[PDB]
Design an enzyme around this catalytic site. Structure first.
Site, PDB file in Angstrom:
ATOM      1  N   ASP B  25       0.794  -1.222   0.000  1.00  0.00           N
ATOM      2  CA  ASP B  25       0.000   0.000   0.000  1.00  0.00           C
ATOM      3  C   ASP B  25       0.831   1.277   0.000  1.00  0.00           C
ATOM      4  OD1 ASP B  25      -1.921   1.878   0.317  1.00  0.00           O
ATOM      5  OD2 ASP B  25      -2.802   1.014   2.171  1.00  0.00           O
ATOM      6  N   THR B  26       0.989   1.901  -1.174  1.00  0.00           N
ATOM      7  CA  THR B  26       1.770   3.102  -1.294  1.00  0.00           C
ATOM      8  C   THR B  26       1.102   4.282  -0.564  1.00  0.00           C
ATOM      9  OG1 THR B  26       0.738   3.649  -3.410  1.00  0.00           O
ATOM     10  CG2 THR B  26       2.768   2.365  -3.502  1.00  0.00           C
ATOM     11  N   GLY B  27      -0.175   4.193  -0.266  1.00  0.00           N
ATOM     12  CA  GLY B  27      -0.871   5.261   0.439  1.00  0.00           C
ATOM     13  C   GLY B  27      -0.760   5.128   1.940  1.00  0.00           C
TER      14      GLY B  27
END
Ligand code: 017
Ligand code: CL
Ligand code: CL
Ligand code: CL
Ligand code: NA
Lengths: 99, 99
Positions: B25-27
């Site tokens: 999850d880059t967020g």
């Protein structure tokens, strides 16, 4: 572009002629933006994140530019703490995760 | 690998001797895992997302094996609906977003 993750992967988006900042978010199925006006009709949607569910307005076939790449697709509008570009539009701009 | 985003980018991780599935999850700034025991000291934290905040336990210097690659860093433990590998560990495995 190749974006490393030492900092938040924030990009400029353009929606309704307006520039905004948004987070490229591989953990989001859908794109969710803070309250703004968009054209046409909307449909209801509930989305679940870390803290619980929220109600959002779902707008379909919205033109949005992301880091200079054009996308046209679904944008959810609601009380998100940050504008997030989810997989529905990351796929349209050709994004992949690589390691 | 190169992971496309048509589907959720889920991988197998090993943490605290346990195999689990997690979202890349880059967020997510930090890695957040569903309730489990981990060794060592911890301190409380609140983290926020769409829906609001949850209280987690912050453990430092935890080793995780992510899709076969070992990484060390902070792991947050609490009532998250999904296990997420956040940027703090994605960086260590050299993950990038490319488009
Ligand atoms: C909202 C972001 C700024 C932050 N989030 C990471 C994000 O990728 C979550 C991660 C996630 C994923 C599933 C469930 C909860 C959280 N996705 C998410 O809320 O996506 C929502 C929009 O599309 C939907 O598809 C997934 C749920 C919906 S977060 O889970 O709240 C969170 C916040 C802080 C840390 N350290 C780790 C994670
Ligand atoms: Cl879409
Ligand atoms: Cl860390
Ligand atoms: Cl690097
Ligand atoms: Na520790």
């Amino acid at each position: 572009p190749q974006i490393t993750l030492w900092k938040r992967p924030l990009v400029t988006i353009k929606i309704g002629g307006q520039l905004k900042e948004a987070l490229l978010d591989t953990g989001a199925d859908d794109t969710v933006i803070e309250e703004m006006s968009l054209p046409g009709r909307w449909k209801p949607k509930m989305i679940g994140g870390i803290g619980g569910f929220i109600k959002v307005r779902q707008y379909d076939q919205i033109i949005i530019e992301i880091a200079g790449h054009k996308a046209i697709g679904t944008v959810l509008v609601g009380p998100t703490p940050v504008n997030v570009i989810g997989r529905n539009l990351l796929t349209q701009i050709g994004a992949t995760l690589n390691f």
